[PDB]
Design a protein around this nucleic acid. Sequence first.
RNA 1: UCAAAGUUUAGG
RNA 2: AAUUCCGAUAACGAACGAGACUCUGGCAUGCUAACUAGUUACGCGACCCCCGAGCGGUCGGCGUCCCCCAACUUCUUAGAGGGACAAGUGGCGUUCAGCCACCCGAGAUUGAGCAAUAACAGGUCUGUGAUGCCCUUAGAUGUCCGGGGCUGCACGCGCGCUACACUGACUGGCUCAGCGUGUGCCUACCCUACGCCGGCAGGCGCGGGUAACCCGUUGAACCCCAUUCGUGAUGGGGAUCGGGGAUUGCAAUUAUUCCCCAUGAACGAGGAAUUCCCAGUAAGUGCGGGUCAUAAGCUUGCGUUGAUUAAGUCCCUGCCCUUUGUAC
Lengths: 141, 61, 141, 49, 191, 75, 137
Amino acid sequence: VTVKDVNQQEFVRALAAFLKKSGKLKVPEWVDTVKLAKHKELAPYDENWFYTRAASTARHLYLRGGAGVGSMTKIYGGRQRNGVMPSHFSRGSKSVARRVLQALEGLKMVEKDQDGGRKLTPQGQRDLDRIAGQVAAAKKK
Amino acid sequence: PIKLARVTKVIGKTGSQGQCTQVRVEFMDDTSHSTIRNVKGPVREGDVLTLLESEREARRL
Amino acid sequence: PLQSVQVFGRKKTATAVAHCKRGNGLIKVNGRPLEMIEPRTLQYKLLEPVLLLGKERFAGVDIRVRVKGGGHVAQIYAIRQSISKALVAYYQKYVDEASKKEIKDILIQYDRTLLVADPRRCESKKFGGPGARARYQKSYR
Amino acid sequence: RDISEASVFDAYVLPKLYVKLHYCVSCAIHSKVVRNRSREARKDRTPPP
Amino acid sequence: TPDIKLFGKWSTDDVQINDISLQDYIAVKEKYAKYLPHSAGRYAAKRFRKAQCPIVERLTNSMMMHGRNNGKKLMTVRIVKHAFEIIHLLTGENPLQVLVNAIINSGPREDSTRIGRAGTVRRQAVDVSPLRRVNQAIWLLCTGAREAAFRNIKTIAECLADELINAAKGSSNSYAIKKKDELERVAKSNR
Amino acid sequence: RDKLNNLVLFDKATYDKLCKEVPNYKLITPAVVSERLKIRGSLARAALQELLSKGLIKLVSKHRAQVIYTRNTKG
Amino acid sequence: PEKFQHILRVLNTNIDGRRKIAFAITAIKGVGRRYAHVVLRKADIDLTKRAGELTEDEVERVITIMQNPRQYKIPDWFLNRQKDVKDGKYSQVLANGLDNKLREDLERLKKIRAHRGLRHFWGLRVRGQHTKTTGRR
RNA sequence: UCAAAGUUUAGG
RNA sequence: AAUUCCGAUAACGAACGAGACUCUGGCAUGCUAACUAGUUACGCGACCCCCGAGCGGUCGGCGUCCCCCAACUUCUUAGAGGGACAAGUGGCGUUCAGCCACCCGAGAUUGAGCAAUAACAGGUCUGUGAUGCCCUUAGAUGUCCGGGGCUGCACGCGCGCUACACUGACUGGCUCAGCGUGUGCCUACCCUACGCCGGCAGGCGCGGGUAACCCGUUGAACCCCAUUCGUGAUGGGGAUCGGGGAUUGCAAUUAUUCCCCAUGAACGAGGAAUUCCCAGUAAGUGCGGGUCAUAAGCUUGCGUUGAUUAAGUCCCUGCCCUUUGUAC
């Protein structure tokens, strides 16, 4: 049983918790202070969000390979209220996407590929596909 | 007496702005009877009106 | 010699190409079973042929699909079209035309969409208004 | 037919209402008893059928 | 599922239409009634084509309204199914029948056409079309619910149920059923 | 006319009303509990998560917008 | 739970302990959703609580962070008065003091007879917007 | 099977 | 739909316009086609690590590592053909021209482009080295440089954008497009992958790209799924305003734009009035082109979500023909 075989919402719930339990990520200094992208009004309501988006970034890297940080800002883009002017697409925060991919670099979930950009590593494919197998065997629901 | 009545022949759309179809209607309980009267909406041969009154019978409008 | 059938489906710009094959009737799309795709309200759509014809008709015919283009609603109807068209093409070729005939009738009386696609497609905007038909507001006075 | 049903007198031939009008020109045209005509069609003193 | 088509949960059969007239244009069933109130459903192409659309799909479509909700359909599918759930718990019986019965006691039986009448406007009473009767019934009551569900803490679904229940019951409490009674009274005043 | 002024507290009488009355309703939604009482809404949600946990109410649907809850599951 | 204050009085303002803390502090002039949220994270509070809860020690803890933010690592940016001319400090003005700093800066431009000051003086739009059409008051 | 609806550069 | 046809007949026999036509939309498991499409399903030759199921085999899943001496065209691109004609069945119609319905299947209707006679003293001399006349012509109405102005605000109108919330807001998560454009230039510079530095706007490195090659499975928005919040001018709304930081620039003050922290206005759905629209249509919703050093609240294209209501009439507003009246 692979990750595609699982409901992706509840997968990253577990992956983030897997990333907490391990306790060797490197969440940086900012976390509290930082915004997350120029989109935003507010800071994330989950105060342990770096674990969640590191999880969401990895699971993306499993599906689509060779993804740079510029690729990562595009995936976490969205609407931007100019407020009184019409909305437009803003790309996600660079540094926090970079700080994530460096964190998975140190974890050895990933490896920076030939022809540029990150791609995930077997020892990472372990964790991702293992936790899918855990989710699949949660219950018949 | 809310008599039902089946449309036999849709005649032509009367009305000022054009809306009220003039429709000839068989009278359900005894089909010998047959008034002509007006309808707001899309009407066709083979449907059933719900006349409240049963004795008015319109003509030109 | 293998009994392969590649069959397409359309909805606006949503090319869903299904692909039947002699097997065990998995039915997954892009690379994941029917219980994602993930607009989710429209689950019964991308189930319909499976619900109508039942698991017996499918049983021994595995159906990998591929989709791209169109939006999320568009892509669902595409696959929904594709998988039911594909099935009809398997039975036409590698069963007998009598079973096909009954299958086809069961789907059509449900909906003509299943096999025969819409020709509906997006009408072009002409200058003097924001859409095809809508005109910009006349000032007059 | 409603009155034919609910008349006492068997069969019975009804009556008829007999009125000679006298429309003046102004009113005759208004009520469209008489339309106008082209200079040629003015000279046709047969009635319409 | 293979022999009979459920509406996700609820049943198609055992939904008896009362008014022979609303019947035929209420498609809760010919036999044909589907899993969802969504369907490519190009019914607009011709005149009475409209009727063959299943009433729940129509009710969803009539819910996709006031610009901010224009085009927003899955948004509205969810609303309907939640209302049907709410109707199921509140009353009991199939919510489909509760909708059908609501529809049935909501559309006017006669209205009042605006004929010219010299210049200053005075109507004639005229007697409504069964398709029109169903249509007005659908929109009246969907509209009734919307305007209930703005600025109070009450979900659309919850409001939509409560109107549909206060419609099926001739409550004179539903916007729809009340607006209808007033419409029919106005027509009586010029019958 | 409308000026609705709500509570955000474990304020004794309301909490005892919830524990008695609310598990008997057929419709139980936070909105409905709000209009029954004069309880805020976030309060009402929290109350109706607490009665599930305890097991005096039933879950019908747990959707983003609307949650639905029922009578006990009586007999 | 917690039966106590519900209503608060902090730094001349009247915060509704009825509200949730992270958005309740924004009742004060000069602290916004951003800043307040940061301030509570450096405070290390369960910010789910309504402001009407919280120990009186905790609200004084919050205020002391709000007043002297950079000492609890609220960085340079999250501060409304930076490199602020009347001594080159970088610091978050609050309360009536915020109003006082504003008025002094306007009075400053006024005293200098600069363009921008003259327009604030005349009750016009200062940020170069077109006024033939708008602001009709 | 008939409501009310007046006026129109000197400046070519 | 049509001065479109039939048919009448002091007319006969023609010319334009309409129609035909061109471009486009949708049907082709039919044909031609491919490393700048796919690959397509094979082969799995595999890599590959437990990647997973599983004691192990066999499967499930992609990423890709793949060329060529694998196999093709379903998806792709675009050629040249076919294809629908009111042809079929039933009515109605002078049993003509035709209209209605239904079969087959797109049902004569996908939407543009082109577009007559005669006008208008419509606009344009500020598009022209198209221009007559008039003017002015060195202390220039020529021309270049510096600066300011077209942005000035008691006010009145026009097309717009954002909203007035909970069918919502915010915070996360999931997950799909289609027309395009792009440097190495007519006078000085494009599009940008990947890595580092920065909260962010951006900065610095190296790469690819005159392009189905690179940007680019363009990983768009709305939507969908978990967040709170709770009808409080509220976390709705985001005006105005202070402080700070970026980039474009020879230069940005009268705020060029971008980012940041703060400030937090009317607005709780709009009087009389009036616009736009019938099928992928309105409306929502983003993204391209244009201008463009800097750069869209405009525009012109693109798609994605996708209704309600009509299928009619001349009441209003207008138009086309005939008769009629007319002191125009």
